[PDB]
Enzyme design. Structure first.
Site, PDB file in Angstrom:
ATOM      1  N   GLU A 197      39.525  51.044  34.328  1.00 52.09           N
ATOM      2  CA  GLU A 197      40.149  49.957  35.066  1.00 52.09           C
ATOM      3  C   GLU A 197      41.437  49.457  34.453  1.00 52.09           C
ATOM      4  O   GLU A 197      42.194  48.806  35.145  1.00 52.09           O
ATOM      5  CB  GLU A 197      39.162  48.764  35.196  1.00 52.09           C
ATOM      6  CG  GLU A 197      37.863  49.135  35.921  1.00 52.09           C
ATOM      7  CD  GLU A 197      38.033  49.357  37.410  1.00 52.09           C
ATOM      8  OE1 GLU A 197      39.249  49.206  37.813  1.00 52.09           O
ATOM      9  OE2 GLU A 197      37.128  49.647  38.155  1.00 52.09           O
ATOM     10  N   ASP A 232      45.143  46.723  43.626  1.00 56.72           N
ATOM     11  CA  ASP A 232      44.340  47.858  43.213  1.00 56.72           C
ATOM     12  C   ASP A 232      44.667  49.105  44.025  1.00 56.72           C
ATOM     13  O   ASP A 232      45.565  49.091  44.846  1.00 56.72           O
ATOM     14  CB  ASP A 232      42.836  47.573  43.116  1.00 56.72           C
ATOM     15  CG  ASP A 232      42.083  47.496  44.437  1.00 56.72           C
ATOM     16  OD1 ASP A 232      42.789  47.695  45.500  1.00 56.72           O
ATOM     17  OD2 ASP A 232      40.909  47.279  44.510  1.00 56.72           O
TER      18      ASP A 232
END
Ligand SMILES: [Cl-]
Ligand SMILES: [Cl-]
Length: 162
Positions: free
Chosen positions: A11, A20
């Protein structure tokens, strides 16, 4: 290696609101803020989550706190889910980490949708499960990450992260 280090690799860490891979407002270590297109709606969710007026920026400590919460929640979600629990219970420690990573990225509902793969994991048919997991939008959209997780389920080792 452990679940925390593994998710940290997948991440990354960002202290400012960012979008994202799906285009949704996120911050920290993969903490989804909202699916709404509104940056205002996201800064509102951010302040609510941190308990202060942030102005779309958080510190490293705050990022880590969201992270601890998110891992705990993912684990608790698995344990409460009738579809996921038995799979998790059946797995060894390394592979349990791979299931957690998937739940963190796609949510409980998302994972619970990998019915056929889940059955194969439960049955300990590693090579077959790896093949089936790859026939998914998940794999086509985030291929490098999906390969690392799939390799983890295939081998029961942390080699993909080494
Ligand atoms: Cl929250
Ligand atoms: Cl990727």
């Amino acid at each position: 290696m452990n679940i925390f280090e593994m998710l940290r690799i997948d991440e990354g860490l960002r202290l400012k609101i960012y979008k994202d891979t799906e285009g949704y407002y996120t911050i920290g270590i993969g903490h989804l803020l909202t699916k709404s297109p509104s940056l205002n709606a996201a800064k509102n969710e951010l302040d609510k989550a941190i308990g202060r007026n942030t102005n779309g920026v958080i510190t490293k400590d705050e990022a880590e706190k969201l992270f601890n919460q998110d891992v705990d929640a993912a684990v608790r979600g698995i344990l409460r889910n009738a579809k996921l629990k038995p799979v998790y219970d059946s797995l060894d420690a390394v592979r349990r980490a791979a299931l957690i990573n998937m739940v963190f990225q796609m949510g409980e509902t998302g994972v619970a949708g990998f019915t056929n793969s889940l059955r194969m994991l439960q049955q300990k048919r590693w090579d077959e499960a790896a093949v089936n997991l790859a026939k998914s939008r998940w794999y086509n959209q985030t291929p490098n990450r999906a390969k690392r997780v799939i390799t983890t389920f295939r081998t029961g080792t942390w080699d993909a992260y080494k």
